[PDB]
Amino acid sequence: TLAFGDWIVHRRWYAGRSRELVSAEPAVVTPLRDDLDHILLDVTYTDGTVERYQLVVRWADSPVAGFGEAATIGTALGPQGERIAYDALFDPDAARHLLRLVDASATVADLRFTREPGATLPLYAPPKVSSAEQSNTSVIFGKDAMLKVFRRVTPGINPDIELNRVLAQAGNRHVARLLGSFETSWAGPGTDRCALGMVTAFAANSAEGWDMATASAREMFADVVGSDFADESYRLGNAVASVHATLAEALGTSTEPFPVDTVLARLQSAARSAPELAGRAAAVEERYRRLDGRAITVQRVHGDLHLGQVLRTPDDWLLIDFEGEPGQPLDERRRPDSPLRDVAGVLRSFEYAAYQKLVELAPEQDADGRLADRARNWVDRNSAAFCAGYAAVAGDDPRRDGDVLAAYELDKAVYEAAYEARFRPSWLPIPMRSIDRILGKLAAALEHHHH
């Protein structure tokens, strides 16, 4: 036995928030080696809720040097005497062992590992745990592959694994290729599946779209917007449309009414967080209600798309992180949606990339608004390029259904406003400006005045 509860509450991936833990106990312990245990740990709260975490424990008969305090779980008596329990994901040999189980498509008790057909795993490469802030734990093997081990685990089909598999197996080149994964059952053999981790090809020497965009939007004296990042935005549009096309073919398309009631509920909630919104709520609602009964085509989509979710390798843009929007339940995250909502996500991201500069400057540094003008011009140029690149692949310009597109942009801006009002008041002018602009964009498109 180990004092799991005392250890887990200090971990950055632990989501207990401000809650009292009743118990933290292993639901399932699966030996991998004589000194390596896979553990499904159930944390029970006072309201009776249970949240399950995945832990891999490396046992040692004496203090091992390389483990930090955060990787030290506890101590316990075993058959040969005292043992120390370490978080095995920080052990190179243990991480390699997991990768080997994936490589072999091994089954260990109720744990099912699978290597994607034809995939090669870098079993020789040095494993190093990612230092990047996240809710899971990732081990990078050399420059070749990333093993992501999920911390909080839940029942059902994992959309990140699911959609990456579809895309990779269809030969889509705009993903970091899924190389393998592993899972178990929720309540023993014969019950709901539970995804545990994934292995993906590591995109070495890549840049995040957000970093490239902000660099472009910060270039001094760039009053005449350049063509280089527009070229990149066009290529990114190609990539997003390509991903959408593969997903549409594999997982189908259908039609639904535009979700007026859903976006209205989000508006009502947002207006409680951002009082600034009440002055615009009537106008937003009118635009949404004009779409009542509008049929929209939906399909499986990325679901949380922005410039932080795309990587530029030396050869291509890749889309990563298909888990869906962080706050939604799994069934909702696997629902089809409009591809235009993904497009809207990128357009919002361009807006923030350009205007972050302005909210960080003092008023006196842009008294005549010329940097603001440049930001607007940069967003317009790159948004147009992105949409054109999308159109080149889709064979249909997202701006054609401009009313639906603008409504999704508006819904995102309303959500952003509520967020900034709560967490970052100085950023609130960004979505508020967007709302006024998009209100006009949407009004124009509803009258079919858009180009």
Contacting ligand ACP (CB under 6 A), which of 176, 194, 375, 438?
176
For residue 164, state whether it binds ligand ACP (rule: CB under 6 A).
Answer: no
Q: Which of 199, 203, 263, 439 binds ligand ACP (CB under 6 A)?
A: 203
54, 200, 216, 238: which one contacts ligand ACP (CB under 6 A)? 200
Residue 140 CB, shortest distance to ligand ACP, in Å, is 8
CB 93 within 8 A of CB 112: no
Task: Report 126-145 residues binding ligand ACP (CB under 6 A).
Answer: 132, 134-136
* Nearer to Mg ion (CB atom), residue 156 or residue 308: 308
- Number of Cβ within 10 Å of residue 389's Cβ equals 24
| 371/376 Cα distance (integer angstroms) | 9
Indicate which of Mg ion, ligand ACP, none lies near residue 42 (CB less than 5 to 8 Å, by partner kind). none
| Binding flag, residue 342, Mg ion (CB under 5 A) | no
Which tokens go with 251?
Answer: 């997982």
250, two tokens: 């594999």
Rank residues 321 and 403 by Cβ distance to Mg ion and give the closer one.
321
Q: Which does 176 bind (CB under 5 to 8 A by kind): Mg ion, ligand ACP, none?
A: ligand ACP
CA distance linking residue 262 with residue 291, whole number of Å: 12
Q: Which of 208, 256, 276, 397 binds ligand ACP (CB under 6 A)?
A: 208
**Is the C-alpha dihedral spanning 415, 418, 420, 425 positive or negative?**
positive
Of 260, 259, 215, 280, whose CA–CA distance to 413 is shortest?
280
Residue nearest to Mg ion (CB): 321
Helices (H) and strands (E) counted in the chain, each on its own, are: 12, 18
Please give the Cα distance from 140 to 135 (Å, whole number): 16
Q: Identify which range of 201-209, 219-227, 319-327, 410-418 contacts Mg ion by CB under 5 A.
A: 319-327
190, amino acid identity: G
Contact partner, 154, from ligand ACP, Mg ion, none, Cβ < 5-8 Å per class: none
In three-state secondary structure terms, 84 is: strand
Beta-carbon contacts of residue 324 (< 8 Å; ≥ 6 apart): 159, 303, 304, 330, 332, 333, 334
Among 334, 288, 109, 302, CA closest to 209: 302
Q: Whose Cβ is closer to Mg ion: residue 162's or residue 321's?
A: 321
Site for ligand ACP in 282-321 (CB under 6 A): 311, 320-321
Q: At what angle do helices 402-423 and 260-273 cross, to 10 degrees?
A: 30
Interface stretch with ligand ACP, choices 163-171, 200-208, 334-342, 386-394 (CB under 6 A): 200-208
321 or 411, CB closer to Mg ion? 321
Residue 401 found at the interface with Mg ion (CB under 5 A): no
Taking CB under 5 A as the criterion, the residue among 37, 91, 321, 411 binding Mg ion is: 321
Contact (Cβ atoms closer than 8 angstroms) between residue 186 and residue 155 = yes
Q: Which residues bind Mg ion (CB under 5 A)?
A: 321
Q: Which residues bind ligand ACP (CB under 6 A)?
A: 132, 134-136, 146, 176, 200, 202-203, 206, 208, 311, 320-321
